[PDB]
Ligand binder design. Sequence first.
Ligand code: 2OH
Ligand code: 2OH
Lengths: 227, 227
Amino acid sequence: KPYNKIVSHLLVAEPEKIYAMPDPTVPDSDIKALTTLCDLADRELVVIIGWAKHIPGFSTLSLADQMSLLQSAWMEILILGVVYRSLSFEDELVYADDYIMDEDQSKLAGLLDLNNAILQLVKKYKSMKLEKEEFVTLKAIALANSDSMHIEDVEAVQKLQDVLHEALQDYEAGQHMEDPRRAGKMLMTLPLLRQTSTKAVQHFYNIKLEGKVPMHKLFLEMLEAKV
Amino acid sequence: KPYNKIVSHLLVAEPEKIYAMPDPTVPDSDIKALTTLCDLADRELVVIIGWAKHIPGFSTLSLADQMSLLQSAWMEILILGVVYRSLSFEDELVYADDYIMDEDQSKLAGLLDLNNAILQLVKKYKSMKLEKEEFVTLKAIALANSDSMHIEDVEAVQKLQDVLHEALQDYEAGQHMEDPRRAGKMLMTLPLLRQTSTKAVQHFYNIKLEGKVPMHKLFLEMLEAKV
Ligand SMILES: CC(C)(c1ccc(O)cc1)c1ccc(O)cc1
Ligand SMILES: CC(C)(c1ccc(O)cc1)c1ccc(O)cc1
């Protein structure tokens, strides 16, 4: 009852912080903000792919299934990260230590409604006192449970889901005896994450079509996935 | 260990079957199909409002909170119903006993992608052997967990969520000892339901804007909710 090994493992597999590095020579605009954010996402996607390899059983899936899970889950993983980084803040989203968006900035970027939904995720997790252990486990569950239409080995993916769910259940049983239903409460946060991700993918797909915001190869690869 | 009372109660509160009654004098078209479906939804929404009153604690919320939960959850409740009605069928959606859509009909109605996602929900629940007891409990959880941005009494809504989650957990502990993680598996089906609902609301909102498909008052009320 030092806690669950999978949880411990995900904690040490957690990537280091990444800076956004908005270009200080460029005038502030919606284009600058969206460019900065998509550039940051592209770099994060590299680290997310590397991170996934540490999840027990993930690297044993076919390359096609690994890619399918990542192409369905990437936005949820990105959003859960900004959510977690923002828990100790008030009405602000910490995309990076050097890129914190308040309401005015979100409006300027055309992201008021989307960032408000992300702040809704933040609000609920603040009330629940979301722990880092729970965050990393939920990121892994979101990956495994992402509902790609293209899975080859359905049973192996369900097995991965079960392994990660078990880890969450075991963690909560040991760490949160005061609330025997806390694991389920955690799982019940996933629908809002999925809802927000679905809308964010459509939003940025539309930005891609408009062609005014430069996007890098990996971000585009994820955005152009069939979902 | 005759099972959970809330589950038993939801089972007897289950509304009776409703027929679609497509107009046999009208030529088949996309407009006919969509008209028929939205008409059916309108009638179902009446029965769903009545049904919600049977859920322990729901009628004790403010009228505003009851409406907020229903306006966020209605599409999920409707979709979970067609999903459940379709479990014993193959690649067909049983909107009603007299309205069963196959792939060609979905294409004709402009609903291929949406109905395919609903069939994805069906596929997963068939594999899990979803029971009526679990269906009705999930409908109630979807209502309570619908993530409206407009809730007045956040704590009372979280209490309702907990009561219903407890019922699911208790049901599974008694009925499914072979799988100590089945309740969580059930909760993990909710993200796809939310994803599909989010897309369906947008789809039918766009049909509303186009103005070619007649819609009744209650369906419109739900569709025009701020979400
Ligand atoms: C994908 C997006 C550019 C992003 C970038 C980086 C990040 O850490 C999280 C999310 C994003 C999505 C939704 C949103 O409202 C703002 C930004
Ligand atoms: C809301 C909709 C008209 C409906 C009507 C009735 C129903 O039982 C379930 C869903 C609907 C949603 C999504 C969809 O693909 C088809 C029909």
